[model samples]
Target: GAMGRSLLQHCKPFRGATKGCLRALAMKFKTTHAPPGDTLVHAGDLLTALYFISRGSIEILRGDVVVAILGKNDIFGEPLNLYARPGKSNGDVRALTYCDLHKIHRDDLLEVLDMYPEFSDHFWSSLEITFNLRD
Candidate 1:
């Protein structure tokens, strides 16, 4: 299996621009581990990057409250990074199980998006989901 292929597979909702976006997302594979109850992104901390889970699961914490569970192949951090709004972060992302992930820095992602017109909508849609743009 190729890297980023799963992202393309699950993110089929983004018709037309998925391939381009995937290609542009020069991901770095640094095998990092987070134990159970470890917070990946602290609430209110600026989201400077996004992570694509390659293995394991995570729990979404809203200021000490667990609100959601995210598993392999899910994308987190994009929504908050894209929103760029100020205030307490919507929640904290913690590993419920050990995980391996591919992370893309905010600067890199935005720089590429600047050149690719098609990626903007999909990126914003990703943000919408995270920002609770719609019910």
Candidate 2:
């Protein structure tokens, strides 16, 4: 229950979602930890899950280049990637410090998006800025 709230607190897009729905959806996600310097996602890897940074920081890397250094409340991985089958990771994400992350499988995320269109719109719009900035 606490972890579910924590995920919602950091992700602003979910603000439009009903508290009940968010809590229900959050329960479907899994939490993971990454020690500093651990690679969360590797460039070219298939996009398996949507990642939310609940604690610490991460660096988005394009090969050896650092595209962005993201901290808590930030999300990584392409949201639209869920639509296309076999979507690949756009870049690498590495933990800049010991990190706690919340990840939802593509199927579950898609269901949530469909169930909460307003939240999906807000989520996609927010991610648009992050994507533009990274390019």
Candidate 3:
């Protein structure tokens, strides 16, 4: 969780000229690490926060079924967090290797997005399509 915090302090998704409104978001997100075979997110598990991969890789499994594979920089599981999908997630996330991640809770994210509406608008527009297209 400390690693997640460090990323929140450092990883600015939108920087420089675009960093103005997103600065506050840096405080609300964090980077976390997990070991191989570790379950990063579980199916039917409560979606606590959004996760963005920073290092290593992970796999997505649905009810013992592998759905997708994700590696560094891939943003996974935000949909369950944002929409409050009923159960765990629709799948399981397992660390393929030692992994690092950025953790952002919905409440904190929403607060920051409130100040930066365009960020969410664009992000969601792209995300909505991507999530819908995913398995």
Each candidate's clash count:
0, 0, 7
Return the clash pairs for model 1, or none: none
Q: Any residue pairs clashing in model 3, and if so which?
A: 3-31, 4-30, 4-31, 44-87, 44-88, 44-89, 45-88
Quote each prediction's TM-score.
0.67, 0.80, 0.72
Candidate 3 ranges beyond 4 A from true positions: 1-17, 80-88, 128-135
Give the total clashing residue pairs for model 2: 0
Candidate 3 residues 1-135, lDDT tens each? 344344443334443314544446566766677999999776667666777777787877878877777776567755532453433466778888899877788677777777777666665554431121123
Instruction: Give model 3's TM-score versus the native structure.
Output: 0.72
lDDT of 2 by residue, 1-135 (tens): 776677766656666667777876787888889999999888888776777778898888887899898877777766653356747777888899999988888778777778777777777775532432122
Ranking by lDDT: 2, 3, 1
Best by the lDDT measure: 2
lDDT of 3 at 132: 19
- Selected candidate, larger TM-score, 1 vs 2: 2
